[PDB]
Symmetry: none
Subunit: 103 residues, 2 copies
């Protein structure tokens, strides 16, 4: 039910995908960790200097009550709330989440 | 001392890491030799595979006994430079044409 969720994607694949045409900085995705079902990671397209398109990755960590967080400073009931929060504020992220990875 | 496009101690894996790092665009490239077989070269070029996304294609550079190289049996060159020259100017069957060497 979410356009930015991929799951059966690898770190290297998140980038092959994210760095590909149709994506811009702010482009992002959340995926299922292959060795830890139920734990997730957020990957986002970022562009830096004397370099350019760079894909940044953040571990979404699981709470003991269900829930997630990248930064202990704020938690979210679900991935949905995490994505709503980050699109509306970078809040420690290389940048604000813009559109989902183009498939 | 090799040319800017040629990388000395480079594996396929490390070659890939180089090209996928920031700075490189499609057509960005490098030629490298085989770590376990002397005189065998390969071309690695940053590009994009529909149904995969951004990838590094690897082309096998074959040898003409007694002088010469070729990736395609339809086109041979007397030197590796003429190979890199041709492909910079004419994609000629590769993903696209070689542009700038892999910046590290």
């Amino acid at each position: 039910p979410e356009p930015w969720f991929f799951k059966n994607l690898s770190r290297k694949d998140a980038e092959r995908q994210l760095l590909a045409p149709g994506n811009t900085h702010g482009s992002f995705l959340i995926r299922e960790s292959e060795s830890t079902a139920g734990s997730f990671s957020l990957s986002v397209r970022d562009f830096d200097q004397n370099q350019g398109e760079v894909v940044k990755h953040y571990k979404i960590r699981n709470l003991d009550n269900g829930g997630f967080y990248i930064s202990p400073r704020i938690t979210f009931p679900g991935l949905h709330e995490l994505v709503r929060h980050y699109t509306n504020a970078s809040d420690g992220l290389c940048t604000r989440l813009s559109r989902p990875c183009q498939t």
